Coordinates of C-alpha atoms and ligand atoms in Angstrom, one line a residue:
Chain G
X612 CA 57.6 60.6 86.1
X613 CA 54.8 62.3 88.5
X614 CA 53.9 60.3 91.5
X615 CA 57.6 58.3 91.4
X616 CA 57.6 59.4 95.3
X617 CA 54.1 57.8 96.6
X618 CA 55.4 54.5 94.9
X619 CA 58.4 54.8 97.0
X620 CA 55.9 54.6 99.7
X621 CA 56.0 50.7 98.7
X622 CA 59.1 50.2 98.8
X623 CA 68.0 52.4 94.5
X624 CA 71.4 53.5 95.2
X625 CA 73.3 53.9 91.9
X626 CA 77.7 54.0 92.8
X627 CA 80.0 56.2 91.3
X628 CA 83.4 57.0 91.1
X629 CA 84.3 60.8 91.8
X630 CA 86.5 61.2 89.0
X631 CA 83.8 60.0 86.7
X632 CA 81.7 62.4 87.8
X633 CA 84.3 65.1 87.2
X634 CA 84.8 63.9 83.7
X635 CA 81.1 64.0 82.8
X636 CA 81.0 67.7 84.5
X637 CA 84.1 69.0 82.3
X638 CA 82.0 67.7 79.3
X639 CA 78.8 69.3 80.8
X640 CA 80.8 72.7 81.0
X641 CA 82.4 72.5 77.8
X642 CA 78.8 72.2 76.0
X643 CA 77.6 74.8 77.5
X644 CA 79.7 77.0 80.9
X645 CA 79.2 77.0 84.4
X646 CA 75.0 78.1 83.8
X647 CA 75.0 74.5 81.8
X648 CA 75.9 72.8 84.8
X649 CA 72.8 71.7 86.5
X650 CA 73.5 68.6 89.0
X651 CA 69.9 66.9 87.8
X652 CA 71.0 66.9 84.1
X653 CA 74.8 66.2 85.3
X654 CA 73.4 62.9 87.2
X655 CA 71.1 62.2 84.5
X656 CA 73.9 62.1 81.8
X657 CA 75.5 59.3 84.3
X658 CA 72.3 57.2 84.6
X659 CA 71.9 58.3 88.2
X660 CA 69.9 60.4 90.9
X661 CA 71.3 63.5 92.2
X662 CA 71.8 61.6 95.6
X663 CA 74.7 59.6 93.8
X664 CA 76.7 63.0 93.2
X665 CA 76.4 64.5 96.8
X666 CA 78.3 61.0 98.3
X667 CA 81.5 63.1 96.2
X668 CA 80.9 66.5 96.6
X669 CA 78.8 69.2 99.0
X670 CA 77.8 71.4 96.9
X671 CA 78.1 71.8 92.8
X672 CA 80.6 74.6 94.1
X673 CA 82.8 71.7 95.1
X674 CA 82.4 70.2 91.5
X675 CA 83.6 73.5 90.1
X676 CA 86.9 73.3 92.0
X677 CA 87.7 69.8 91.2
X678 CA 86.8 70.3 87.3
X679 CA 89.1 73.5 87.1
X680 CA 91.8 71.0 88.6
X681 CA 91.1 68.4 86.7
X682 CA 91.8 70.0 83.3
X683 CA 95.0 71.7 84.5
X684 CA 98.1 71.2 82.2
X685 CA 100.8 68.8 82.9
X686 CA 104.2 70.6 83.8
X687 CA 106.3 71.8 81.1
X688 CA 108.8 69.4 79.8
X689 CA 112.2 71.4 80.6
X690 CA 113.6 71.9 77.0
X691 CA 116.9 71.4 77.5
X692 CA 117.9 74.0 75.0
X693 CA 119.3 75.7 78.4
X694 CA 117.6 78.5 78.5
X695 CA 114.4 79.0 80.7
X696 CA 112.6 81.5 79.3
X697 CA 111.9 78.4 76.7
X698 CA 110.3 76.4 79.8
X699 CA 108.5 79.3 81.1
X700 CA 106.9 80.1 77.4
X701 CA 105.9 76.6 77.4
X702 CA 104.0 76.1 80.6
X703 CA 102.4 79.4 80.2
X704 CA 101.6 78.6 76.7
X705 CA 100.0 75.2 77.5
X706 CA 97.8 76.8 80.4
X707 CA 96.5 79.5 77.7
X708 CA 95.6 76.3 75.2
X709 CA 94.0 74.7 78.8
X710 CA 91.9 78.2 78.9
X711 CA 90.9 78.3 75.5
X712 CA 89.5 75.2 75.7
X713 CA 87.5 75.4 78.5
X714 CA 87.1 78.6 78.7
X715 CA 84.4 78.4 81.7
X716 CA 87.7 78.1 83.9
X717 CA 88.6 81.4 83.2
X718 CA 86.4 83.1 85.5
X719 CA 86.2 80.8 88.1
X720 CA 90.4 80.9 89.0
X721 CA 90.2 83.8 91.0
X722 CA 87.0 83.2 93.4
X723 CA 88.4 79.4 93.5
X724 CA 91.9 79.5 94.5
X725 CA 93.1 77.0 91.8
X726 CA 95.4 74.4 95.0
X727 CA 94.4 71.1 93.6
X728 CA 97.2 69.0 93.1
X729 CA 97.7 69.1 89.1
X730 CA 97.7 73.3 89.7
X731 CA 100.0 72.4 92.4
X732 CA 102.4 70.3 90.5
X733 CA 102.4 72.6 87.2
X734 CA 103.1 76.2 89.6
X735 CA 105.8 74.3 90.8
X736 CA 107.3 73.6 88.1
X737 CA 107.2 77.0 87.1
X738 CA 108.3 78.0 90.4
X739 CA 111.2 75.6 90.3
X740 CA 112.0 76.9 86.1
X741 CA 112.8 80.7 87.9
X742 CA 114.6 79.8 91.1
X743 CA 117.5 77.8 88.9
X744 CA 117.4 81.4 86.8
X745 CA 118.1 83.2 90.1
X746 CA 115.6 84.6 91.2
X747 CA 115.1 86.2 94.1
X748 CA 112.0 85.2 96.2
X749 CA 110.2 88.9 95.4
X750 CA 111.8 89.1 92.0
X751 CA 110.2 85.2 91.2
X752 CA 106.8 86.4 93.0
X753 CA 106.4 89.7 90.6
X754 CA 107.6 87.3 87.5
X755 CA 105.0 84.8 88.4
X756 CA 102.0 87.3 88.8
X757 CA 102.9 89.3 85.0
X758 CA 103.5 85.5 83.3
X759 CA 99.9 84.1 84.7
X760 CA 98.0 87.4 85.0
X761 CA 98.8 88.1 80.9
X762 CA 97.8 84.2 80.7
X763 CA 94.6 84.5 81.8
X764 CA 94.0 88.0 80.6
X765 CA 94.8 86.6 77.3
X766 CA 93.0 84.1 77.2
X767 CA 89.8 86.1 78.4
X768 CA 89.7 88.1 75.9
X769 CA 91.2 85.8 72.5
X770 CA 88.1 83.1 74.6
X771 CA 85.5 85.7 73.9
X772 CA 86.8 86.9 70.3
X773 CA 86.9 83.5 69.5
X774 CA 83.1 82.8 70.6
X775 CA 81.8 86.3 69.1
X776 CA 83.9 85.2 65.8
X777 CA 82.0 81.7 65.8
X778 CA 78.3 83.2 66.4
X779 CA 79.2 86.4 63.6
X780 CA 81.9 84.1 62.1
X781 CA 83.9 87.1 61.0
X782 CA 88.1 87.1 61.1
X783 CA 89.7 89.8 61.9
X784 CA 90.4 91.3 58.6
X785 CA 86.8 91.2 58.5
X786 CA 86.1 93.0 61.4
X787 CA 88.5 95.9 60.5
X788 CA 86.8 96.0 57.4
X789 CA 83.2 96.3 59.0
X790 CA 84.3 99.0 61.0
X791 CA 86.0 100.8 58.6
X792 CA 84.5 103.9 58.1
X793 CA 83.6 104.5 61.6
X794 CA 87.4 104.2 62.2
X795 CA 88.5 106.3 59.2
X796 CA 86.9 108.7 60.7
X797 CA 87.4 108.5 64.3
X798 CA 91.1 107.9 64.3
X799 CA 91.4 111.2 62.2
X800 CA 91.7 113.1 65.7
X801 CA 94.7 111.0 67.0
X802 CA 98.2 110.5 65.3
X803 CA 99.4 109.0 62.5
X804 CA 100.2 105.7 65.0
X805 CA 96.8 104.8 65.9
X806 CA 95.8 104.4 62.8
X807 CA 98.8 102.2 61.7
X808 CA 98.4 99.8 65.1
X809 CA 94.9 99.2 64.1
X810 CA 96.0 98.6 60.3
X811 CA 98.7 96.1 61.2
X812 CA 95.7 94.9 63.6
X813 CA 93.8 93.6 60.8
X814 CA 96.5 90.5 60.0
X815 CA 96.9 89.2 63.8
X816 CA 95.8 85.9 64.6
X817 CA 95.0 84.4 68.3
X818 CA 98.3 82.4 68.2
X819 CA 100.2 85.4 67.1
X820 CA 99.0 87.5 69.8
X821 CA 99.6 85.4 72.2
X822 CA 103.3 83.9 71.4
X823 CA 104.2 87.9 70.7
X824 CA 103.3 89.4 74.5
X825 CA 104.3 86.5 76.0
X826 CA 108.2 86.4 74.2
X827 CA 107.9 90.1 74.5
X828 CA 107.0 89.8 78.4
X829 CA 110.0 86.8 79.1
X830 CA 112.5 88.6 77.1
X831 CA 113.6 91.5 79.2
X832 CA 113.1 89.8 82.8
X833 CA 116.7 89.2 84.8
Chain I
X985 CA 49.0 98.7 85.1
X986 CA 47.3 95.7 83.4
X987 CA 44.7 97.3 80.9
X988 CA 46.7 100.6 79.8
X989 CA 46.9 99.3 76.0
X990 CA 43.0 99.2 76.0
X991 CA 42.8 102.9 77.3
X992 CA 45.5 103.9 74.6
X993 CA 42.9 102.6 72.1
X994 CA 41.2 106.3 73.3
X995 CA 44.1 107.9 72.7
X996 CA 53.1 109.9 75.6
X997 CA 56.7 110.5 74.5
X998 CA 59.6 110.9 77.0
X999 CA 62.5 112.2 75.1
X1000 CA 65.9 111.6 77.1
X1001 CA 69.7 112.1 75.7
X1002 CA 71.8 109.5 74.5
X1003 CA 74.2 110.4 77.3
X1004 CA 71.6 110.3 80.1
X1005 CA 70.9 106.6 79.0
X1006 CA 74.5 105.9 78.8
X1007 CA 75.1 107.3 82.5
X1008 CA 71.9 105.6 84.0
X1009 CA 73.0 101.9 82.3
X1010 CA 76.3 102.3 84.0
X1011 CA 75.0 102.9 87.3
X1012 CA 72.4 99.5 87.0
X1013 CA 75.4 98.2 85.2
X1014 CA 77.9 98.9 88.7
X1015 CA 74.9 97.6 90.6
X1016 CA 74.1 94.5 89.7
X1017 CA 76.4 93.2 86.5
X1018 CA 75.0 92.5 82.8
X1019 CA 72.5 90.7 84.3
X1020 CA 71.1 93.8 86.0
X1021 CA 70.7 95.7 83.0
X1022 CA 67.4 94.8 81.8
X1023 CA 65.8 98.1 79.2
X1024 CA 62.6 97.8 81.1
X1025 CA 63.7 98.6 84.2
X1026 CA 66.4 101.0 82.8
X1027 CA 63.6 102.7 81.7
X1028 CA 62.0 102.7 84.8
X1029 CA 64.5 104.1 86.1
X1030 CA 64.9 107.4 84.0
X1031 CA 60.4 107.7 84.6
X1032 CA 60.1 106.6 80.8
X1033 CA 59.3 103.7 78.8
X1034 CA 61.6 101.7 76.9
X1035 CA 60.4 103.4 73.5
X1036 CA 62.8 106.2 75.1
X1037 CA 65.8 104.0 75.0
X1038 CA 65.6 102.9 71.6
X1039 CA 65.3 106.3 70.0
X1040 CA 69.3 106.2 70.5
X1041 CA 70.3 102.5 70.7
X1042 CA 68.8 100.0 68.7
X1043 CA 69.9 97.3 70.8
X1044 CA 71.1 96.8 74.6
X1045 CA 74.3 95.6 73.3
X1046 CA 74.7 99.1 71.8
X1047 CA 74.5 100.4 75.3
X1048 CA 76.7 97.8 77.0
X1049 CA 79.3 99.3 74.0
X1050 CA 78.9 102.8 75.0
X1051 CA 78.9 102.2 78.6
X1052 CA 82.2 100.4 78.5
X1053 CA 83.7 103.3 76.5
X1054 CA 82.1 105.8 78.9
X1055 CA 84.3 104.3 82.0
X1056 CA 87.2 104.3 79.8
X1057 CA 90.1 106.3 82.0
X1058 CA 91.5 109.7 80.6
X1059 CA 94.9 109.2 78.8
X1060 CA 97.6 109.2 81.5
X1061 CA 99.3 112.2 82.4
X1062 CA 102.8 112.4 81.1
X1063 CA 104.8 112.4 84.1
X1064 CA 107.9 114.3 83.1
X1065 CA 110.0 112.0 84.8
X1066 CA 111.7 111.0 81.5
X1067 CA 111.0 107.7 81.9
X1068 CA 108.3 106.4 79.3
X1069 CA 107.9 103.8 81.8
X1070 CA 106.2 105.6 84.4
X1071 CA 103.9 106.7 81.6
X1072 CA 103.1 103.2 80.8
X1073 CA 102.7 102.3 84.4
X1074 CA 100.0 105.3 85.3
X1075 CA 97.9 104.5 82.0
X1076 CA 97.9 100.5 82.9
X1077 CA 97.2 101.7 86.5
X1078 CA 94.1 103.7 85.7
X1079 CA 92.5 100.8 83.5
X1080 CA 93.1 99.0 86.0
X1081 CA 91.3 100.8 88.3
X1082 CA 88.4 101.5 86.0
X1083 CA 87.7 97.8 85.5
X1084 CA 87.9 97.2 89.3
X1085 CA 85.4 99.8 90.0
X1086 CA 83.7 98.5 86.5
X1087 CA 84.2 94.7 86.5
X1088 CA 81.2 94.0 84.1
X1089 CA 83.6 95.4 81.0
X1090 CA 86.3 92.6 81.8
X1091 CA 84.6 90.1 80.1
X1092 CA 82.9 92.5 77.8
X1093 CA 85.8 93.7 75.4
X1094 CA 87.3 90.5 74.0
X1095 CA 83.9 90.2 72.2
X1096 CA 83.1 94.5 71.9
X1097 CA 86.7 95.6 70.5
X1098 CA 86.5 98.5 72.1
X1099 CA 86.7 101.8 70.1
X1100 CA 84.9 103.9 71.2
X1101 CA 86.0 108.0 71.5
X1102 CA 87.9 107.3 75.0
X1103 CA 89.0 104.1 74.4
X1104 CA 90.6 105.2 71.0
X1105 CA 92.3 108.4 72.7
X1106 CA 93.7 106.1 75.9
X1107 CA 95.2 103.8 73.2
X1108 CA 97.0 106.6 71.3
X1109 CA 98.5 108.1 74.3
X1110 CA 100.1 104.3 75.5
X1111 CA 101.0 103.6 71.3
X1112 CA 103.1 107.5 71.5
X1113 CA 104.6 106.6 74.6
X1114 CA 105.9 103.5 73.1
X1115 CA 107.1 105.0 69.8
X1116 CA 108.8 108.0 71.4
X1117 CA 110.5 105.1 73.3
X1118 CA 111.8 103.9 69.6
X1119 CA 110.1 100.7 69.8
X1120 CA 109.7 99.8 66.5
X1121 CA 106.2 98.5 65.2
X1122 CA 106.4 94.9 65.9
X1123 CA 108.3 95.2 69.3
X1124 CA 105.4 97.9 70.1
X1125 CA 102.7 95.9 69.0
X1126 CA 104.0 93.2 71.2
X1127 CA 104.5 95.2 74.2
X1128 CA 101.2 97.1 74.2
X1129 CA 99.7 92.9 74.3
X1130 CA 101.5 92.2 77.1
X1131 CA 100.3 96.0 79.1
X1132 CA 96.9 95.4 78.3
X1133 CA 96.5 91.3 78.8
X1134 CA 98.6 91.7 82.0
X1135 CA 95.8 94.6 83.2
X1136 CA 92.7 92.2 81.9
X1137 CA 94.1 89.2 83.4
X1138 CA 95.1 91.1 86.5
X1139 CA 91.4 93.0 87.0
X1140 CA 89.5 90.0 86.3
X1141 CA 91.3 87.6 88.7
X1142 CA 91.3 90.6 91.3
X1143 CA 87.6 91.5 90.6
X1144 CA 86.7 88.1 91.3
X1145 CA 88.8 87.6 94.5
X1146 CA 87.4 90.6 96.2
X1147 CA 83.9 89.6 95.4
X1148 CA 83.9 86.3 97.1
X1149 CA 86.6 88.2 100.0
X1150 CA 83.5 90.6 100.2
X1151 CA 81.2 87.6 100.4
X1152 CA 82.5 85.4 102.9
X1153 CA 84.7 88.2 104.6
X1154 CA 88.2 86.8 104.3
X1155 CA 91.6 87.8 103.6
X1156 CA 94.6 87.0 101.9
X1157 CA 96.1 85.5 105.5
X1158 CA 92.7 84.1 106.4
X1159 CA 92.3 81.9 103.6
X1160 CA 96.2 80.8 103.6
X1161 CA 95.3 79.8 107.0
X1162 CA 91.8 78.2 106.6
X1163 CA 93.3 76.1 103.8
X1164 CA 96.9 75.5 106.0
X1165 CA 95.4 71.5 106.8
X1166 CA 95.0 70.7 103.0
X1167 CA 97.9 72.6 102.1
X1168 CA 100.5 71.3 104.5
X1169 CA 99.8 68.4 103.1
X1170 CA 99.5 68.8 99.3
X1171 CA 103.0 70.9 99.4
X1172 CA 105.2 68.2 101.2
X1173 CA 104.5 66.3 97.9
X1174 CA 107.1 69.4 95.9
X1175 CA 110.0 71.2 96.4
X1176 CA 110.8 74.0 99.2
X1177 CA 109.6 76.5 96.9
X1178 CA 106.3 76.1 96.5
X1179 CA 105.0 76.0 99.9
X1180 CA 107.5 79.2 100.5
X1181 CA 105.3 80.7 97.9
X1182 CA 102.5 80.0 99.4
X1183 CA 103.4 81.5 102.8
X1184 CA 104.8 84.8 101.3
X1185 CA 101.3 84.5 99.5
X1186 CA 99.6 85.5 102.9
X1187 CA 101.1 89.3 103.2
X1188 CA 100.2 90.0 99.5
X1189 CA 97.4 92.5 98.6
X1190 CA 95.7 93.5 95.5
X1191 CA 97.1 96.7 95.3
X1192 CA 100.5 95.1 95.2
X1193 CA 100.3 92.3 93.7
X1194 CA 99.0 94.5 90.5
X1195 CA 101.8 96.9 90.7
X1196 CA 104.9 94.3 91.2
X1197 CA 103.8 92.0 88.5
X1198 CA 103.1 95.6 86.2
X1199 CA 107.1 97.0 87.8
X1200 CA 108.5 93.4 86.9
X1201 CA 107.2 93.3 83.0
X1202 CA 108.3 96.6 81.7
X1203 CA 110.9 97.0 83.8
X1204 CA 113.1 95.0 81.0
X1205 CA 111.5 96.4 78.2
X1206 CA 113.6 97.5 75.5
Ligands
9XB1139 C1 94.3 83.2 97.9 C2 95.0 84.5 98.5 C3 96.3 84.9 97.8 C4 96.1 85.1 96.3 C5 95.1 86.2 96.0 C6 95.1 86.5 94.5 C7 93.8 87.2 94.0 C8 93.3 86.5 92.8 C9 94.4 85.5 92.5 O1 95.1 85.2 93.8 C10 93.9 84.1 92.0 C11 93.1 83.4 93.1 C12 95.2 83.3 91.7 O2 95.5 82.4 92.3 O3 95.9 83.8 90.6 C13 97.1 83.2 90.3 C14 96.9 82.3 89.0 C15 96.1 83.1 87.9 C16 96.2 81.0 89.3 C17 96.6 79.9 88.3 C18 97.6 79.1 89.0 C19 97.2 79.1 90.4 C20 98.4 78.9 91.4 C21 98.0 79.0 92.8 C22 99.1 78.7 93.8 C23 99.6 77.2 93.7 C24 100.6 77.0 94.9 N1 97.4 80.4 93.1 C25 96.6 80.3 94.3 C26 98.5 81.4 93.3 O4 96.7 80.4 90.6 C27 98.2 84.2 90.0 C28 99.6 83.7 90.1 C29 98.0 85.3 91.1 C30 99.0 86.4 91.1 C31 99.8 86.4 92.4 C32 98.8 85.7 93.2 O5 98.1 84.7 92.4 C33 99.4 85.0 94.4 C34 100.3 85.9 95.2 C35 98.2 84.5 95.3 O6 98.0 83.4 95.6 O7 97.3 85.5 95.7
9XB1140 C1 89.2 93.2 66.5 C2 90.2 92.3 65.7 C3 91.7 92.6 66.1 C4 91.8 92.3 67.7 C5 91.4 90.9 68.1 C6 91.8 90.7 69.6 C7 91.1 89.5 70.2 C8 90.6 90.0 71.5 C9 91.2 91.4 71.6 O1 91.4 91.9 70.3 C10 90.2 92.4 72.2 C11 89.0 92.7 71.4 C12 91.0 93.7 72.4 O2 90.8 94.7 71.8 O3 92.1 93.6 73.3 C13 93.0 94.8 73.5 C14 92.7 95.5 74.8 C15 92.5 94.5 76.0 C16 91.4 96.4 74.7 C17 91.4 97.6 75.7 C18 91.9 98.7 74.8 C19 91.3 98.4 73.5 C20 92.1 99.1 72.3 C21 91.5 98.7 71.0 C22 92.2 99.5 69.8 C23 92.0 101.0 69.9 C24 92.6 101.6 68.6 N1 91.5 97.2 70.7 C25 90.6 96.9 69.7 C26 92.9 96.8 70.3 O4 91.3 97.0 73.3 C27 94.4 94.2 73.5 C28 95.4 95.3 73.2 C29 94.5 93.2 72.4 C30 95.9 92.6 72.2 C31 96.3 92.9 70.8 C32 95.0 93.0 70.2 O5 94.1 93.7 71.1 C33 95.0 93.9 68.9 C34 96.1 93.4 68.0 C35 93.6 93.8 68.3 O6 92.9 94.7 68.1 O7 93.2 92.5 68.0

């Protein structure tokens, strides 16, 4: 309320814990990205001044960092079915479902080197998953870079499908539908093929998508 | 000037092309991101008011779909090498490109499938490569996911690395070495591997890093 300051004059520290302050700003960024992330409303939704946040963190730069950490997967549990490509498919499947989720992470990974320690422990893991396979250190590095870059570009682009789909709430059969006769038309100066990849488009689903590249990806390496 | 609707009371069209538009929304688009694309000051910007613009689009998502199909590269050409997989390789390498030099389309197409006139002929060219390889159409399907999320996730996680390198001016080794305190530290808590990867992390570049992770996937496709 206006004039709060001149009372002051006249004479309230509120404690928190860093990690619940990281837990109220993944639930801040999940309703609504990185632009609904405002430390005044974040310290309000804790029953606090903004001067209880900045004991935790510098800057809300900081809070990014620790958020993108905090909602990091777990390592893969190693299958046991003896083959790797099984782990690897799981720990990059379990970071896409991470993404989807919080999708604001997406774009923050790579001006926010993600070094926290749960990114630390799952890359490891992964790490570790390709080494027993054999691996060579520039063989594992290339691996590494295809299985997370076609994570993150996958879940870029299923993340914004899915949030156009919500707002327009239209599937993909839908949407090939819609577009129709533009593509009836336009696909008319290319070859038979491009017209039967964006047929069979019509029936793919996000999870589908993603499981196919990724099996299609981890098949062929060694 | 405040008052010019009261002087219109006693008693000017600026016709422009569609293409003109397209061209001038790219270059505010390169500029300053989706958020530099305001129609007033595109407008502005080709000496007309936004009437002008709306002859031809009836919406500025219109033109943020045809300026992400205007950037689209040209089909890659056919290297003659024999190997479909150089093919594959040039076409990923010049989207890649595009969206480095373009970086407001990364997160642009997962919600504006794009098929437009150069996107649609760039995608025909990769789908023939792949079925004069004999994949057949599920194998291709899946492959052409993996190309294309690889080059997404790859550009955006590039793009936004060398706009914060840009920023606060640092490289690869430079951060490996501002963060060596914390990651000394953070490492000792895994095996060997992971702070190994970290130090060959150091001599990587973007260049690179794109085209090992892009070598390493289709290498064993097929
Ligand atoms: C910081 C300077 C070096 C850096 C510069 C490149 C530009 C952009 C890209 O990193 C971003 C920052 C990024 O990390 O993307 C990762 C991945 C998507 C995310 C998600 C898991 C997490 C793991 C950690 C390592 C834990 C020990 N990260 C730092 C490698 O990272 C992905 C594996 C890419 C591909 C290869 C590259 O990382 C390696 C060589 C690297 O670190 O390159
Ligand atoms: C619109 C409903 C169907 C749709 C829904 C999925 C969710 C998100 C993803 O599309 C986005 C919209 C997207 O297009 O990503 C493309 C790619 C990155 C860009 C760049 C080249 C351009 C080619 C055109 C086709 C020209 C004939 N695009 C529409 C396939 O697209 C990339 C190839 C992904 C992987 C596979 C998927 O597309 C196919 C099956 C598809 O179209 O799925």
């Amino acid at each position: 309320q206006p004039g709060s300051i001149w009372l002051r004059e006249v004479k309230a520290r509120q404690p928190l814990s860093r990690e619940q302050i990281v837990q109220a700003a993944v639930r801040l960024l999940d309703e609504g990205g990185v632009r609904n992330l405002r430390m005044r409303q974040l310290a309000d939704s804790l029953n606090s001044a903004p001067m209880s946040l900045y004991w935790h963190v510098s800057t809300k730069d900081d809070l990014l960092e620790l958020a993108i950490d905090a909602v990091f997967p777990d390592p893969p549990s190693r299958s046991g079915t003896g083959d790797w490509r099984d782990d690897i498919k799981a720990g990059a499947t379990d970071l896409f479902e991470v993404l989807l989720r919080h999708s604001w992470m997406i774009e923050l990974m790579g001006g926010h080197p993600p070094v926290g320690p749960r990114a630390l422990a799952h890359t490891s893991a992964i790490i570790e998953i390709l080494e027993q396979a054999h691996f060579s250190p520039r063989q594992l590095d290339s691996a590494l870079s295809a299985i997370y870059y076609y994570t993150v570009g996958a879940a870029l682009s299923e993340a914004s499908w899915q949030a156009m789909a919500r707002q327009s709430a239209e599937s993909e059969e839908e949407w090939v539908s819609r577009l129709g006769p533009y593509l009836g038309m336009a696909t008319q100066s290319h070859p038979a093929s491009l017209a039967d990849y964006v047929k069979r488009s019509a029936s793919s689903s996000t999870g589908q998508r993603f499981h196919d590249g990724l099996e299609c990806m981890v098949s062929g390496m060694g």
